[PDB]
Write a protein that binds this ligand. Structure first.
Ligand SMILES: Nc1nc2c(ncn2[C@@H]2O[C@H](COP(=O)(O)OP(=O)(O)OP(=O)(O)O)[C@@H](O)[C@H]2O)c(=O)[nH]1
Ligand SMILES: Nc1nc2c(ncn2[C@@H]2O[C@H](COP(=O)(O)OP(=O)(O)O)[C@@H](O)[C@H]2O)c(=O)[nH]1
Ligand SMILES: Nc1nc2c(ncn2[C@@H]2O[C@H](COP(=O)(O)OP(=O)(O)O)[C@@H](O)[C@H]2O)c(=O)[nH]1
Ligand SMILES: [Mg+2]
Lengths: 71, 131, 429, 420, 67, 420
């Protein structure tokens, strides 16, 4: 009798554990998705910085030629 | 009723999960659920958790403290099994129990759909809040 | 540049893909050996100068799978693109989307993962899932979900085969179809529907063969798909764009379920006796008897139409046929789209398969149209679904597999939202 | 793959299993010697194919007789679960005193045959409801295998008490005791009866000197045709679970009538043509069933058809469309497209076509009610009771078995006419 | 016999499941490391309008001097 | 090389040695004539291979009978140490009055056979514990050879008093007297018992007319399979000392149970397949042991396996991994990877595979306790004592033998459950 009770109990425990495992699997998928998205959004960061480099360079290059003429 | 209570919650869960099975027999997700789980005035739980467990007070909690609390409760401190009680809910770094991990575990086990998550470590938190 | 991926999931999609590739090789000049005695879109490089298709044949029931792996077309497919299950989905959606789907989904995702890594310029997906069965419903739904959550930006053209209007190879078709329609909305960016009755009528009284069979049906679908992909395969006069297909045939992301048609379907015995002019074919083009699906042309008011001309086609006969069809009252368009016609000329005639009923002719045209008639198929599926859901039938087969009961209803009024929009978009002002 | 295990029970089930293995050997080209001259067979060194077929029974004379006839070497010498006393037409004998000590020999051997495979999609039981051994022992095996393996599908090719006469005086008792333990743990009960089997071998087949091996051959050809869509290719294949879904809309009304075709006279086998419209005529003909319940005195909750042979699919489509068109209210209309259809791609041995019709309908409820009627008659007036009551059974269980049968049939009948 | 088989299957399932549990735990530790790393890349995103603004205020000065 | 010397003792040991030499001759292709048609044999002019096998006993009727049967020419005419009186089922007779005057004839002949080799890696004794001669004489030889040669490994294929009946009335006395002088100077006691041997030749092998030559053939096939990994090549070879290390973690718990495989029915020898998973099933099956102690009523301190035949090593790896996976607590878990595995590269005569399992486990302690129980019973109540006490033995030694057995078993049991 105690054997069968504890066996059914261990069954319930394993069911519990596979429930937890599949939940952790789905949240791992969610991690993957959020990660991919945020990685793209942060690639946008490097691109925006890279372009403003050239923008700053142009804004200085025009002023350099302007300096001699206005003087 | 110190040991018999940890046995009550155990046996109630044993019946609860049988009925949970019966229910199917008859007929950033972690944080998105954490934020919404119970936000009661858990200053009682925090002050009590530090007052009974947190000794040094640097966001860190080990097996020695739980073992000494168990022994002080008049409970037969199983020499090495208390490690599993420390581990069962540790999810980021094995042998890392932060106050934030207390929040996460306490909360996921307090407000949820089914439970069954450990059902066995935060029963002690339930006991310390109980008395 | 342009590469297109095709999943053939289920038992319907896998046979459709068998015929697709058996026709693709004979058209491009590939023998079943994998040896060939352009093909950029379908055929890859193996470092020995020969071709392995960029497609995956997926199915829970392994029968047709070992059929293809020990048939005559073994030398084409890669052993990495044929994965089998040892069970089915019991024709219910839950066993194919909840229980048995999860251990095949990651393997298929890794295979197409590496396959999209293999080809350089992916342009679109083609999901081939006859929803009538549990696999083609649930596993195809989950495949489309994962495809859209991983890729997303790329277009997906689903050739889904619904439960037929009144005939059925299964009784629990109404459940596992309404449930796939949910995922079919978001994921299948454009969904060219298929049903069985119209191709049956076509094969019976159009090619004059007296028993139409599934091999002939899949060959005929493969011929339609050849007329579809010829524009990207071979060079044409005015090449069309498959991303133009979306921007011209999706007036709203809510109306993207589209139907098709093909001309000419004629035996050689009447091809030798018919003239089959460029203007003449454009009439059987919109012929309601020629219709490929269970849609009525006068039921829907045409919102977008793409014509696929292939062979020896001169543009002005095309332009004058557009004029005559827009003149005569038997056709009509939506008022908000004053011009809903897009045509694409191609100088490649249809290739011929040995052993086919199909006849070689100079000019071929393929119609693909976004209209509002499909809502009748929608409501007709809803008929059977409500007639089964009102009485509790097969509900246990679904709930005993990790499925809740409310998904039946949520999918029912999900497809009802399509029926609503499809009549709200096509009215006057 | 998608395995089967063939457990038997009673002399009836033993003979039927013997002839079924004969048929499947003669179909797969297997001699009585066990060679080829795995979905059913097992590999054995020396180039042999052993059927994983277990023969259990409380008497060995049946065991000896099935060993003696041809195709006997198929069964290996361990799966002969030997009973020495015999239940002697007593459900108590066959289910409690000898059950509770044969269970575990059968358990060891069924675990043997089950671990022998990789994926055991379904079981296979053939037994009786009237014989003490067959009934009690068989439904007990069903209960046990459904206790440990909850994920398989249970299936019984079950013979019931005959209408015109009861084969054994306690047919009603044993039959209600078998169905009471059949309903919940048996997933597909193909209902057969010796008398209707007699009718189908008599009427249209000229057979004037029949024999039990002959009826076994008939029902075994049917038993092979029900599943021949599995081990063979086909344009539109199925299984035990697509069939189970398309057949049962409720876990209770899952008892099925079966028929197989073609079957015509032999002297007239040349004068007639042989076509698929003729196959439809043949079995949608009322008389071609294998149960003493004409289904057109009731309604079809649903029906499945499985073809064998390579013809078109236009066929099966016009087939179930035409049959629904006229015998519509002979079916039930509350469920759409209640006829399911599949195709196996191979014809029978020596012939052109085969067709298997299976039906989840509501005309076996009268069979159940006639069983319960005979039971209640002998039951109140206490006929033939001490054989059950002096062996650790009480009539409280008899009352509950009778009432449970009645409950099953009450759902059957109300689902016959439920419409909305 | 039933008891021994029961304990056997329980041990098998428990070890098999806990291995994969720890594997998914590490997969979540991947979120742990990245969230921090991509937050650092977000701090780098904060070098947009700041440095784009070096460009823009330098543009004010430069083009004002030109005009 | 790595020699063996085969000393025998008692009629039991004599018959077992005879049949073991028969088996090894029939395996190495040696006739009863002694030709080939050195790890076990010796070279002799004329092209002969003599087994260095010594047969000592206190009675010559056994000697005559083993000479008479086939394969008798193997043993050369000096190694027949002849006893004329017989100990007559008396440990005192077989160990003190006749021991202390046969010791030295045996010493001269064992020095003979030991100098005959270059490196004598291990000994070989087969004797009894119950027969006066076998027990006393044999444990005395063990003491003497372990006195002069401390670097060899001692090994006894020892038969114990039978459970259901004692073969000789003083089985308990002689058995405790043998184990008391066995523990310290015998390094590997393979425990065998006539009754379990009967069980293994009866149950799964159809043998209905057994014989002592048959049990001898069985245990000699096992005795050849335990060491066949030595004289033959193999991908992963072992010896007596790798085995001894991997088997004993303590010098006391070094008594081993043995089994050999394959052994199935012959009429059913064709129906079954024949694979290494089946070999594992065969002997990790409880009933296949050769001792009256089901090891699953205890725990495995450790276990070694020795294969024969050429298959892969993936096999043995998944083998002991799978078996540890389910019958884990059937072993002891305080020791890592308690299963050792090796491969001999040659299959048996006429068959495909062979497997030998040896086990250092804690289930023979109950055998020891039943021996001590029978002893103490006859011992306090003084049953059958003057036969031991009127021949220069005192019961102080009996008390110490009993207590020493009890001490051994007390360690066995506490090491069963010792965990940390
Ligand atoms: N056009 C076309 N349709 C097909 C073909 N083969 C099967 N179908 C359709 O597919 C439907 C069933 O879809 P599937 O998902 O493939 O069925 P299944 O593979 O048995 O799925 P399960 O029930 O889970 O085993 C049938 O009703 C057919 O109408 C084919 O070769 N061509
Ligand atoms: N179809 C068929 N039925 C049989 C055969 N032999 C017996 N039966 C039926 O099986 C029933 C006997 O049940 P059974 O369990 O075998 O009897 P028991 O072994 O004494 O308990 C009778 O009602 C017979 O009608 C046979 O060869 N074929
Ligand atoms: N396995 C086996 N055991 C035997 C055989 N003959 C005798 N025995 C056992 O050996 C024991 C006799 O011991 P033994 O020393 O030979 O008797 P002794 O010579 O009179 O002292 C008995 O308990 C028998 O069970 C045999 O041929 N084979
Ligand atoms: Mg399928």
């Amino acid at each position: 009798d105690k054997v069968m009770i504890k066996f059914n109990e261990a069954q319930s425990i394993r069911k519990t554990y596979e429930q937890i495992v599949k939940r952790l699997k789905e949240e791992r998928v969610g991690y993957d998705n959020q990660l991919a998205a945020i990685e793209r959004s942060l690639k946008g960061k490097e691109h925006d910085f890279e372009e403003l480099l050239l923008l700053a360079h142009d804004a200085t290059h025009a002023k350099e030629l302007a300096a001699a003429e206005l003087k | 009723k110190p040991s018999v209570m940890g046995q009550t919650a155990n046996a109630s869960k044993n019946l609860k999960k049988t009925e949970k099975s019966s229910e199917e027999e008859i007929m950033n997700n972690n944080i998105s659920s954490a934020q919404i789980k119970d936000n009661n005035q858990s200053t009682t739980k925090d002050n009590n958790a530090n007052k009974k467990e947190g000794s040094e007070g640097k966001d860190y909690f080990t097996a020695k403290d739980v073992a000494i609390i168990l022994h002080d409760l008049g409970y037969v401190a199983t020499k090495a099994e208390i490690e599993q009680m420390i581990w069962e809910v540790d999810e980021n770094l094995d042998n890392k129990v932060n106050s934030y991990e207390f929040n996460l575990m306490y909360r996921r086990c307090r407000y949820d759909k089914t439970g069954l998550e450990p059902r066995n470590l935060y029963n002690l938190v339930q006991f310390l809040m109980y008395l | 540049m342009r590469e297109v991926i095709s999943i053939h999931v289920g038992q319907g999609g896998i046979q459709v893909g068998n015929a697709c590739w058996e026709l693709f090789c004979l058209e491009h000049g590939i023998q079943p050996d994998g040896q060939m005695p352009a093909f950029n879109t379908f055929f890859s490089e193996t470092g020995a100068g020969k071709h392995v298709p960029r497609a995956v044949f997926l199915d829970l029931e392994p029968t047709v799978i070992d059929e293809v792996r020990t048939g005559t077309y073994r030398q084409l497919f890669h052993p990495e693109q044929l994965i089998s299950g040892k069970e089915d989905a019991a024709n219910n959606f839950a066993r194919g989307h909840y229980t048995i789907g999860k251990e095949i989904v990651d393997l298929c995702l890794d295979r197409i993962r590496k396959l999209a890594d293999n080809c350089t310029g992916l342009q679109g997906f083609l999901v081939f899932n006859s929803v009538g069965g549990g696999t083609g419903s649930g596993l195809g739904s989950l495949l489309l979900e994962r495809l859209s959550v991983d890729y997303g930006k790329k277009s997906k053209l689903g050739f889904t085969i619904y439960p037929s209007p009144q005939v059925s190879t299964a009784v629990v078709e109404p459940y596992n179809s309404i449930l796939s329609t949910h995922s079919l909305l978001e994921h299948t960016d454009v969904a060219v529907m298929l049903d069985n009755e119209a191709i049956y009528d076509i094969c019976r009284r159009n090619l004059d063969i007296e028993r139409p069979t599934y091999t002939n049906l899949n060959r005929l679908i493969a011929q339609v798909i050849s007329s579809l992909t010829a524009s990207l395969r071979f060079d044409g006069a005015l090449n069309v764009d498959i991303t133009e297909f979306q921007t011209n045939l999706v007036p709203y992301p809510r109306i993207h379920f589209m139907l098709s048609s093909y001309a000419p379907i004629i035996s050689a015995e009447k091809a030798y006796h018919e003239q089959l002019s460029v203007a003449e074919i454009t009439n059987s083009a919109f012929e309601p008897a020629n219709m490929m699906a269970k849609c009525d042309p006068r039921h829907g008011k045409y919102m977008a139409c793409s014509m696929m001309y292939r062979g020896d086609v001169v543009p002005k006969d095309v332009n004058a046929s557009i004029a005559t069809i827009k003149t005569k009252r038997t056709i009509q368009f939506v008022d908000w789209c004053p011009t809903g016609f897009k045509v694409g000329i191609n100088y490649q005639p249809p290739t011929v398969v040995p052993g086919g009923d199909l006849a070689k002719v100079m000019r071929a045209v393929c119609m693909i149209s976004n209209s509002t008639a499909i809502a009748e198929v929608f409501s007709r599926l809803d008929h059977k679904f409500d007639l089964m859901y009102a009485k509790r039938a097969f509900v246990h087969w679904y709930v005993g597999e990790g499925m809740e009961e409310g998904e039946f209803s949520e999918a029912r009024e999900d497809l009802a939202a399509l029926e609503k929009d499809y009549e709200e978009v096509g009215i006057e002002t | 793959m998608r395995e089967i295990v063939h457990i038997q029970g009673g002399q009836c089930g033993n003979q039927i299993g013997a002839k079924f293995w004969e048929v499947i050997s003669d179909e797969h080209g297997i001699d009585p010697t066990g060679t080829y001259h795995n979905v059913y067979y097992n590999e054995a060194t020396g180039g042999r194919y052993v059927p994983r077929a277990i023969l259990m029974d409380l008497e060995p004379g049946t065991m000896d007789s099935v060993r003696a006839g041809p195709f006997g070497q198929l069964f290996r010498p361990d799966n002969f679960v030997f009973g020495q006393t015999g239940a002697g037409n007593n459900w108590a004998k066959g289910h409690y005193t000898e059950g509770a000590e044969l269970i575990d020999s059968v358990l060891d051997v069924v675990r043997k045959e089950a671990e022998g495979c990789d994926c055991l999609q379904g079981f296979q039981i053939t037994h009786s409801l009237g014989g003490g051994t067959g009934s009690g022992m068989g439904t007990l095996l069903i209960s046990k295998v459904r206790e440990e393996y909850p994920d398989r599908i249970m299936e019984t090719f079950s013979v019931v008490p005959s209408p015109k006469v009861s084969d054994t005086v306690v047919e009603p008792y044993n039959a209600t005791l078998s169905v009471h333990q059949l309903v919940e743990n048996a997933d597909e009960c193909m209902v057969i009866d010796n008398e209707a089997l007699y009718d189908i071998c008599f009427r249209t087949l000229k057979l004037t000197t029949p024999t039990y091996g002959d009826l076994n051959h008939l029902v075994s050809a049917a038993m092979s045709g029900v599943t021949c869509c599995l081990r063979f290719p086909g344009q539109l294949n199925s299984d035990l679970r697509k069939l189970a879904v398309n057949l049962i809309p409720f876990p209770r009304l899952h008892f099925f009538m079966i028929g197989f075709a073609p079957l015509t006279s032999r002297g007239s086998q040349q004068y007639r043509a042989l076509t698929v419209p003729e196959l439809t005529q043949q079995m949608f003909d009322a008389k071609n069933m294998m149960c003493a319940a004409d289904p057109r005195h009731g309604r079809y909750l649903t029906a499945s058809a499985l073809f064998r042979g390579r013809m078109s699919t236009k066929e099966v489509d016009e087939q179930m469309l035409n049959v629904q068109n006229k015998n519509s209210s002979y079916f039930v209309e509350w469920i759409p497209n209640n006829i399911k259809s599949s195709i196996c791609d191979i014809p029978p041995k020596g012939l052109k076509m085969a067709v298997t019709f299976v039906g989840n309908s509501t005309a076996i409820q009268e069979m159940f009610k006639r069983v319960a009627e005979q039971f209640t008659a002998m039951f109140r007036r206490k006929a033939f009771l001490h054989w059950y009551t002096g062996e650790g059974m009480d009539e409280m269980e008899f009352t509950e078995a009778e009432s449970n049968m009645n409950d099953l049939v009450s759902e059957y009948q109300q689902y016959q006419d439920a419409t909305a | 016999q039933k008891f021994n088989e029961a304990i056997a299957v329980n041990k098998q399932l428990r070890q098999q499941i806990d291995s994969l549990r720890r594997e998914r735990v590490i997969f979540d530790n991947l979120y742990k490391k990245l969230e921090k790393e991509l937050h650092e890349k977000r701090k780098q995103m904060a070098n947009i309008i700041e440095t784009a603004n070096t460009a823009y205020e330098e543009r004010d000065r430069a083009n004002d001097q030109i005009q």
